[PDB]
Design an enzyme around this catalytic site. Structure first.
Site, PDB file in Angstrom:
ATOM      1  N   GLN A  75       4.465 -10.623  -0.951  1.00  9.61           N
ATOM      2  CA  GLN A  75       4.136 -11.721  -0.046  1.00  9.61           C
ATOM      3  C   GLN A  75       3.265 -12.819  -0.665  1.00  9.61           C
ATOM      4  O   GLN A  75       3.408 -13.975  -0.253  1.00  9.61           O
ATOM      5  CB  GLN A  75       3.468 -11.168   1.216  1.00  9.61           C
ATOM      6  CG  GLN A  75       4.402 -10.330   2.059  1.00  9.61           C
ATOM      7  CD  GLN A  75       3.688  -9.468   3.086  1.00  9.61           C
ATOM      8  OE1 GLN A  75       3.321  -9.944   4.158  1.00  9.61           O
ATOM      9  NE2 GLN A  75       3.492  -8.186   2.761  1.00  9.61           N
ATOM     10  N   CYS A  96      -9.124 -13.461  -3.789  1.00 12.06           N
ATOM     11  CA  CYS A  96      -8.425 -14.543  -3.106  1.00 12.06           C
ATOM     12  C   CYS A  96      -8.144 -15.691  -4.057  1.00 12.06           C
ATOM     13  O   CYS A  96      -8.979 -16.586  -4.245  1.00 12.06           O
ATOM     14  CB  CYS A  96      -9.227 -15.025  -1.902  1.00 12.06           C
ATOM     15  SG  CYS A  96      -8.284 -16.065  -0.795  1.00 12.06           S
ATOM     16  N   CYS A 146      -4.790 -12.382   3.883  1.00 14.46           N
ATOM     17  CA  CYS A 146      -5.032 -13.496   2.991  1.00 14.46           C
ATOM     18  C   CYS A 146      -5.618 -14.709   3.730  1.00 14.46           C
ATOM     19  O   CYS A 146      -4.965 -15.728   3.982  1.00 14.46           O
ATOM     20  CB  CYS A 146      -3.792 -13.981   2.215  1.00 14.46           C
ATOM     21  SG  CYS A 146      -4.186 -15.127   0.916  1.00 14.46           S
ATOM     22  N   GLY A 194       0.804  -1.211   0.000  1.00  8.38           N
ATOM     23  CA  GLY A 194       0.000   0.000   0.000  1.00  8.38           C
ATOM     24  C   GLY A 194       0.837   1.260   0.000  1.00  8.38           C
ATOM     25  O   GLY A 194       0.542   2.204  -0.734  1.00  8.38           O
TER      26      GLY A 194
HETATM   27  C1  LIG Z   1       1.483 -16.068   2.798  1.00  8.21           C
HETATM   28  C2  LIG Z   1       0.696 -14.909   2.224  1.00  8.21           C
HETATM   29  C3  LIG Z   1       0.015 -15.068   1.018  1.00  8.21           C
HETATM   30  C4  LIG Z   1      -0.728 -14.017   0.468  1.00  8.21           C
HETATM   31  N1  LIG Z   1      -1.390 -14.214  -0.741  1.00  8.21           N
HETATM   32  C5  LIG Z   1      -2.064 -13.207  -1.243  1.00  8.21           C
HETATM   33  C6  LIG Z   1      -2.751 -13.407  -2.506  1.00  8.21           C
HETATM   34  O1  LIG Z   1      -2.758 -14.443  -3.168  1.00  8.21           O
HETATM   35  N2  LIG Z   1      -3.437 -12.302  -2.945  1.00  8.21           N
HETATM   36  C7  LIG Z   1      -3.511 -11.077  -2.300  1.00  8.21           C
HETATM   37  O2  LIG Z   1      -4.165 -10.162  -2.820  1.00  8.21           O
HETATM   38  N3  LIG Z   1      -2.857 -10.901  -1.115  1.00  8.21           N
HETATM   39  C8  LIG Z   1      -2.173 -11.913  -0.627  1.00  8.21           C
HETATM   40  N4  LIG Z   1      -1.486 -11.727   0.552  1.00  8.21           N
HETATM   41  C9  LIG Z   1      -1.672 -10.462   1.284  1.00  8.21           C
HETATM   42  C10 LIG Z   1      -0.755  -9.319   0.892  1.00  8.21           C
HETATM   43  O3  LIG Z   1       0.607  -9.677   1.104  1.00  8.21           O
HETATM   44  C11 LIG Z   1      -1.053  -8.146   1.827  1.00  8.21           C
HETATM   45  O4  LIG Z   1      -2.460  -8.013   2.024  1.00  8.21           O
HETATM   46  C12 LIG Z   1      -0.505  -6.801   1.368  1.00  8.21           C
HETATM   47  O5  LIG Z   1       0.920  -6.856   1.402  1.00  8.21           O
HETATM   48  C13 LIG Z   1      -1.029  -5.705   2.268  1.00  8.21           C
HETATM   49  O6  LIG Z   1      -0.282  -4.499   2.022  1.00  8.21           O
HETATM   50  P1  LIG Z   1      -0.034  -3.452   3.169  1.00  8.21           P
HETATM   51  O7  LIG Z   1       0.653  -2.268   2.481  1.00  8.21           O
HETATM   52  O8  LIG Z   1      -1.273  -3.185   3.941  1.00  8.21           O
HETATM   53  O9  LIG Z   1       1.028  -4.202   4.109  1.00  8.21           O
HETATM   54  P2  LIG Z   1       2.481  -4.761   3.808  1.00  8.21           P
HETATM   55  O10 LIG Z   1       2.666  -4.965   2.348  1.00  8.21           O
HETATM   56  O11 LIG Z   1       2.635  -6.018   4.638  1.00  8.21           O
HETATM   57  O12 LIG Z   1       3.462  -3.601   4.240  1.00  8.21           O
HETATM   58  C14 LIG Z   1       3.378  -2.977   5.539  1.00  8.21           C
HETATM   59  C15 LIG Z   1       4.707  -2.303   5.772  1.00  8.21           C
HETATM   60  O13 LIG Z   1       4.672  -1.545   7.002  1.00  8.21           O
HETATM   61  C16 LIG Z   1       5.952  -1.622   7.590  1.00  8.21           C
HETATM   62  N5  LIG Z   1       5.853  -1.263   9.001  1.00  8.21           N
HETATM   63  C17 LIG Z   1       5.313  -1.997  10.024  1.00  8.21           C
HETATM   64  N6  LIG Z   1       5.353  -1.397  11.193  1.00  8.21           N
HETATM   65  C18 LIG Z   1       5.961  -0.178  10.917  1.00  8.21           C
HETATM   66  C19 LIG Z   1       6.300   0.924  11.729  1.00  8.21           C
HETATM   67  N7  LIG Z   1       6.078   0.977  13.045  1.00  8.21           N
HETATM   68  N8  LIG Z   1       6.880   1.988  11.135  1.00  8.21           N
HETATM   69  C20 LIG Z   1       7.112   1.942   9.819  1.00  8.21           C
HETATM   70  N9  LIG Z   1       6.847   0.957   8.955  1.00  8.21           N
HETATM   71  C21 LIG Z   1       6.276  -0.084   9.572  1.00  8.21           C
HETATM   72  C22 LIG Z   1       6.431  -3.041   7.310  1.00  8.21           C
HETATM   73  O14 LIG Z   1       7.855  -3.057   7.298  1.00  8.21           O
HETATM   74  C23 LIG Z   1       5.896  -3.265   5.882  1.00  8.21           C
HETATM   75  O15 LIG Z   1       6.873  -2.945   4.898  1.00  8.21           O
HETATM   76  C24 LIG Z   1      -0.755 -12.782   1.132  1.00  8.21           C
HETATM   77  C25 LIG Z   1      -0.064 -12.616   2.323  1.00  8.21           C
HETATM   78  C26 LIG Z   1       0.657 -13.665   2.879  1.00  8.21           C
HETATM   79  C27 LIG Z   1       1.390 -13.439   4.177  1.00  8.21           C
HETATM   80  C1  LIG Z   2      -8.090 -14.576   0.139  1.00  5.02           C
HETATM   81  N1  LIG Z   2      -6.908 -14.389   0.249  1.00  5.02           N
END
Ligand SMILES: Cc1cc2nc3c(=O)[nH]c(=O)nc-3n(C[C@H](O)[C@H](O)[C@H](O)COP(=O)(O)OP(=O)(O)OC[C@H]3O[C@@H](n4cnc5c(N)ncnc54)[C@H](O)[C@@H]3O)c2cc1C
Ligand SMILES: *[C-]#N*
Ligand SMILES: Cc1cc2nc3c(=O)[nH]c(=O)nc-3n(C[C@H](O)[C@H](O)[C@H](O)COP(=O)(O)OP(=O)(O)OC[C@H]3O[C@@H](n4cnc5c(N)ncnc54)[C@H](O)[C@@H]3O)c2cc1C
Ligand SMILES: COC1=C(OC)C(=O)C(CC=C(C)C)=C(C)C1=O
Ligand SMILES: COC1=C(OC)C(=O)C(CC=C(C)C)=C(C)C1=O
Ligand SMILES: COC1=C(OC)C(=O)C(CC=C(C)C)=C(C)C1=O
Ligand SMILES: *[C-]#N*
Lengths: 407, 405
Positions: free
Chosen positions: A43, A339, A161, A14
């Site tokens: 991921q 998903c 996920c 994001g």
């Molecule tokens: C095993 C697995 C399989 C998945 N398969 C799928 C799939 O098939 N399809 C799908 O759509 N999604 C899938 N996902 C989900 C997807 O990875 C996440 O939903 C997505 O990365 C969410 O994005 P985000 O930006 O909210 O969080 P993230 O991409 O996880 O990033 C959050 C960031 O915040 C940072 N952070 C944390 N705390 C702090 C802090 N205090 N200060 C500063 N930075 C901080 C972390 O370092 C990280 O870089 C899967 C996830 C996993 C774990």
């Molecule tokens: C559904 N991931």
């Protein structure tokens, strides 16, 4: 104080995506990303890494390589949010102020809430696809499996996920068949939930697989302890408080309990549960009009996925631009999420749905079917478009494709 | 400073446990960490808000209930470090312990409702959940002339799940006895899908609901108060993005609630922020010298003072046998009680266990509205609380239940 017109908390899916869109809107010098990790991970591919089908090394790139060029990367952890003064704190003893804040801090993994973890991962036969430190241990456990229970867990918390905890069960089942040891494997899915999936169309399709492939699901069953030296796991029965079951495993895949990031839990920007408290449709904060949230850290009542992030990023792009004009947002997030349920080494049931938890499929055909095409998309097309399109601000989910198809 | 037994919180559970622990390890070996100068018997706030009792009577000086000889550390806990057997407080001290009892209660989060708590400076809105707002419930009830009387239930865990509707039944009765019943449109807007979790009492409340013409709106959660305009915004939890703005002539707010902030990020909590204890023994799952009691725990039963009483008898045994190098044997059954005030002289005494099934103390049907139970709630219970439970001599009514059976 160091100051940025647009400050992005988190350099994940994001945060990088919103930073690339905001760069185009305010100029790269007016955007900063706060992110401690040297590495940025796609991921979703960890599911296939845990199943031995993809390399862990290819799931990540240096964080500096995905920072949109000219955007400031502040390598630090956010330690406090002070939205009443338009500033935050970081663990390098600095304060940073902003005109607009975008919070994209993801979801937090809490392995240590399970007694015996993460120390248990030092022993054989136990893995977890949710962590860079444990996904390859899933694959080792799968490989070295000879005989017994293969157990797959789902915690009593929100998760990202929701389908990944069982995807790796279907991959493990297929691996046992491919290597001639299916009859030696008793495959158990112990889930805290009461249903195999939240959308009936795909729950039905997964249940047929559960029956054909002779899988056991125990509902309202939560992993509370691992004794890794003894290859034993303890499950509480959420329906009968106090009753617990001890069971041996030949392979254990742990889906960890997850929670809002610790810095948000007590923050003024959280709701009472600790998630960033945003409008369900515009992603503007309910109480701080210059704050916004995207992805796993929000309280958006839909599946926490990268696909949901992509759809949200398109809405939030519009929301911010009209808030910049002191106008009222009109384009609304519908809860889109996706998903890609990997059910074998060459099949995916592509679940797609919205806030109503009803099917919202992109393609003209029936996605409740196991499909090779959908496997190839997940395994090979999605990573490429993630790195080269979504992270660059050019992917807002497939709504246009869906409307272009139904034509 | 170091103590054999350190108690975090000087409320219902912490005082009770400190008194029980004084008799085990010596008063000089117990300490309580608690910031508040006043200790409140909160159950009576239901009747304060209805005007039936006085607020002053519900609190006593904290020093008044501290067991004699037990050190009162007037401060707030700010960090728990169970791997080093110590905690930190807001006057920058480190306190170590041999055993730790966590009784930090539940946290009220009014400010997660936009417009609160500043909206409480306006008329027509109150909340029985806070010493600062319970008398404003009563003022709002008295000044009501005509319109909607709105009673809310948040989308979080709560303490005393029945109190949000107790004050609705009392207000319904107050409106009849003052002539303005026909002028009141009384609605209960709750985030949940049922009126109560235990079927026997739910059904009994349901006929009260029908017979007294009360409206229950399920899956409606209060998200904003516009106090100067007398409007309440509800989100529809079944249709994300849908809301409803409703005018009110009286609004009773049950606030969102959550684990105390210091517990949210602490190693002693589970992923949700509650103290992570064994469901039967109340010993912490991961730190064998840590224990929890009351609202701050993750014990999957209703968060009540009656639950605290029953828990304190079990916790007492658990810690004693642990100090004697024995394995705890006596198991908590989830006992809790909800004295549902249904009027100014009736109570439906709900009692149930972990199975959400009735476990009634008395040999008569408690699902009936009873004056005996009202008088027990309103007059007996507070006497029993100050002079027996807080002194370590009340572990709940299981022994009475067997007597009457
Ligand atoms: C095993 C697995 C399989 C998945 N398969 C799928 C799939 O098939 N399809 C799908 O759509 N999604 C899938 N996902 C989900 C997807 O990875 C996440 O939903 C997505 O990365 C969410 O994005 P985000 O930006 O909210 O969080 P993230 O991409 O996880 O990033 C959050 C960031 O915040 C940072 N952070 C944390 N705390 C702090 C802090 N205090 N200060 C500063 N930075 C901080 C972390 O370092 C990280 O870089 C899967 C996830 C996993 C774990
Ligand atoms: C559904 N991931
Ligand atoms: C309106 C209302 C009506 C109720 N009616 C009933 C009823 O009829 N029957 C019933 O059984 N129960 C009832 N209850 C519930 C009952 O009050 C509680 O369940 C009981 O008080 C729980 O005890 P506790 O010790 O866990 O929490 P509390 O008694 O609230 O004590 C928690 C203590 O922790 C302290 N504390 C908090 N944070 C910190 C910190 N960081 N450091 C140090 N100290 C801290 C607080 O100052 C407080 O003294 C009612 C509650 C309310 C609000
Ligand atoms: C409760 O979890 C389980 C099911 O429901 C998801 C099943 O359908 C099955 C197969 C069921 C039938 C009715 C043939 C098993 C073995 C099981 O453990
Ligand atoms: C990798 O994360 C994902 C997305 O973000 C890049 C998607 O847009 C989508 C939706 C895309 C299509 C073509 C349906 C899915 C399924 C997904 O898993
Ligand atoms: C004040 O809190 C309460 C207790 O603790 C003192 C109880 O023991 C009980 C149960 C006691 C009896 C005699 C049933 C109730 C109902 C209660 O509300
Ligand atoms: C129920 N109190």
């Amino acid at each position: 104080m160091n100051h940025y017109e647009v400050l992005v908390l988190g350099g994940g899916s994001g945060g990088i995506t919103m930073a690339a869109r905001m760069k185009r809107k305010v100029g790269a010098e007016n955007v900063a990303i706060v992110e401690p990790s040297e590495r940025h991970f796609y991921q979703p591919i960890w599911t296939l890494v845990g199943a031995g089908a993809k390399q862990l090394s290819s799931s990540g790139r240096p964080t500096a390589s995905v920072i949109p060029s000219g955007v400031e990367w502040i390598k630090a952890r956010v330690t406090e949010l002070n939205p009443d003064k338009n500033c935050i704190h970081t663990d390098d003893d600095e304060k940073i102020s902003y005109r607009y804040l975008i919070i994209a801090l993801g979801i937090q993994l809490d392995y240590e809430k399970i007694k015996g973890l993460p120390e248990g991962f030092a022993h054989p036969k136990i893995g977890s696809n949710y962590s860079v430190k444990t996904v390859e241990k899933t694959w080792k456990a799968l490989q070295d499996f000879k005989e017994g229970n293969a157990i797959f867990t789902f915690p009593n918390t929100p998760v990202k996920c929701a389908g990944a905890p069982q995807k790796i069960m279907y991959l493990s089942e297929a691996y046992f068949r491919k290597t001639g040891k299916r009859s030696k494997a008793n495959i158990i899915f112990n889930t805290s939930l009461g249903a195999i999936f939240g959308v009936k169309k795909y729950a039905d399709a997964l249940q047929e697989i559960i029956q054909e492939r002779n899988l056991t699901v125990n509902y309202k069953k939560n992993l509370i302890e691992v004794r890794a030296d003894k290859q034993e796991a303890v499950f509480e029965n959420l329906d009968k408080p106090g009753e617990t079951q001890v069971i041996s495993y030949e392979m254990l895949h742990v889906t960890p309990p997850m929670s809002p990031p610790d810095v948000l839990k007590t923050s003024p920007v959280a709701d009472a549960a600790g998630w960033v408290d945003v409008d369900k449709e515009t992603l503007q904060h309910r109480r701080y009009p210059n704050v916004f949230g995207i992805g796993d850290c929000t309280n958006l009542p839909t599946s926490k996925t990268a696909a949901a992030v992509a759809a949200q990023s398109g809405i939030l792009d519009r929301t911010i631009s009209v808030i910049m004009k002191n106008q009222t947002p009109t384009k609304k997030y519908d809860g889109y999420t996706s998903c890609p349920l990997v059910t074998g080494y060459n099949r995916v049931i592509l679940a797609e749905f919205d806030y109503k938890a009803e099917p919202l499929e992109t393609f003209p055909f029936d996605q409740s079917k196991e499909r090779l095409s959908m496997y190839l998309m997940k395994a090979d097309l999605m990573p490429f478009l993630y790195w080269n399109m979504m992270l660059r601000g050019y992917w807002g989910g497939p709504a246009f494709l869906r409307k272009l198809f139904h034509l």
